[PDB]
Structure 1
Amino acid sequence: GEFLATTLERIEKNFVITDPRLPDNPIIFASDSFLQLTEYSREEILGRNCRFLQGPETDRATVRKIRDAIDNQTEVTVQLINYTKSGKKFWNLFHLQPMRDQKGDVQYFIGVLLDGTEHVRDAAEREGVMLIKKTAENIDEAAKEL
């Protein structure tokens, strides 16, 4: 297949990296785990905005929260239902944050997905947010010199 994984894309988390300096903030890196979760090949999602994950049951109020975080160049953590290539639904405890360069400018966005079978609360929410925020901090490290 085209676009074999880089070293970074074999990290064992579901994540993407987008480039907001390109039109429509497209995916430029996507982990192996993300591509199995979502059942796409890497080549058919590179260069596309992540909105292909959305479908009829995806709450548009929650999508707007992501949109507004991107516009304000800030982080957000939300839960929403997303869809795979084959149409299967999954809950996504999702964390976005910008990655800044050495001048503080936003260079990339990082998105980390914790897939589940239900909306989580309380301890499962806390532990999931702990994991996706630690993961985002790790990808900030991993992506800084790309």
Structure 2
Amino acid sequence: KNFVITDPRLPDNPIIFASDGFLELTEYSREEILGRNARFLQGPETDQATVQKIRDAIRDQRETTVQLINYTKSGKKFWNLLHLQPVRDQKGELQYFYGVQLDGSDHVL
């Protein structure tokens, strides 16, 4: 299904890997999204308290699961059930982050 990998060691933690399900989910091409921060999926109705929560889980470098409003390339509004997981190397060094994305409406339970 849908997942991405970001590189926090790079400027602004860009997406550096994107699965086919993620492209299908967002209506974006892999060219369009590699090198960018995932925040591009956010828009007007997106709750900032939730974004701050994501900002906080990333700062602390801990995993989390949230539900926030995202937008496809064509402007379609969806609940993104978003799970983050930090990844450290063999010496406890943060190397990446991973994200698994779900359409919350397709998965209300």
1:62 to 24, 34, 50: 50
The answer to whether the 8 A contact 1:18-1:27 is kept is yes
Who is 1:97 aligned against? 85
Identity over aligned pairs, percent: 83
Which structure's CA Rg is the greater one?
A: 1
Amino acid at match of 1:39: E
1:123-134 alignment, distance < 5 Å: 124=109
Structure 1 or 2: more strand by fraction: 2
Verify: 1:37 aligned to 2:25, yes or no: yes
Verify: 1:22 aligned to 2:10, yes or no: yes
Runs of 5+ consecutive residues of structure 1 not aligned to the other structure: 1-12, 125-146
Query: Which structure would you say has the larger RCO, counting Cα contacts within 8 Å and 6 or more residues apart?
Result: 2
Who is 1:50 aligned against? 38
The answer to whether the 8 A contact 2:67-2:104 is kept is no
Verify: 1:78 aligned to 2:66, yes or no: yes
TM-score normalised by structure 2 residue count: 0.95
Who is 2:76 aligned against? 88
Amino acid at match of 1:88: K
SS at match of 1:17: strand
Cα RMSD of the aligned pairs, angstroms, is 1.3
Cα distance in 1, alignment partners of residues 94 and 20 from structure 2: 25
TM-score normalised by structure 1 residue count: 0.71
The answer to whether the 8 A contact 1:93-1:115 is kept is yes
Structure 1 or 2: more helix by fraction: 1
Cα distance in 2, alignment partners of residues 19 and 104 from structure 1: 16
SS at match of 2:31: coil
Runs of 5+ consecutive residues of structure 2 not aligned to the other structure: none
